[PDB]
Design an enzyme around this catalytic site. Sequence first.
Site: not given
Length: 330
Positions: A35, A199
């Site tokens: 994780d 992004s």
Amino acid sequence: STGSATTTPIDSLDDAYITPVQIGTPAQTLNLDFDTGSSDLWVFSSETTASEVDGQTIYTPSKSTTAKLLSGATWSISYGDGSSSSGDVYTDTVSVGGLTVTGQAVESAKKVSSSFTEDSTIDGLLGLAFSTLNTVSPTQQKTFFDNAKASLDSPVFTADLGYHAPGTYNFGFIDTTAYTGSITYTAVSTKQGFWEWTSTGYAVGSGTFKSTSIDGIADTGTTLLYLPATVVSAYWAQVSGAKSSSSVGGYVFPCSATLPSFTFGVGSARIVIPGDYIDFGPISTGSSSCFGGIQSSAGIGINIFGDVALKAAFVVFNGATTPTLGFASK
């Protein structure tokens, strides 16, 4: 040194991925959820209340000749999903795919919430975010990655997740056969303790690319992709009969529709998520409504590039002194 381990989806939907991990001497092998959204190594234990254990392999420190109680140390953690666990802390030897760390903090669960009890396949979590997020008190502990960094040939690990198929976690080297083209690296902000990046835009199907900054985190521990309402609404508008549902808690669509692809930007590069990766199947057995793999971030506070996006790429987590994230197509 290096290490290499196979990760395997726990079910038909790729809801999570489990990786065998050796803890203790002699080894006890647990299937852990790697994780990159958290920073604690916690396992079900001989200390977990017997009512909150339903079919998991448990860690038994009393059977390990290298286990030592970290006297006085406690942890308590909660995840975005509403999950929770807590307990005491041991140090022990931990190996992943041949890579061994001595004296790793192993947090033993005396209590787990029921999302964890509910699934027999996940014995615990291996956190690979930054150690600043570790919940051990009064002495914060380091992640397996931070502890191994010294001995790694290169301070990197890579996530190569499979679509309905096994994949690989590699530590300390970049497998140049695992991807095509070149790797695009982008800057990471560690300010909140996550692998946080920006992004450069998105596209829906064969539509035009929209240049817009989307801050978000790379999280192997989250199944879906969570993005701003404006982006998500523009995706689902292209799917006949899709709608945001009341009762279900997100966007659903007729199981008969075909999903467009989704493209997200990494600097000047593009990563394409095929439409099939966005189909998470019927909301219940026999239903003709299917659950979407792209959902709104609005009720979370953070955008999350989860497994749906990560599995479309070869991902390099570069934990150099100036950390970066690399993406390649595969």
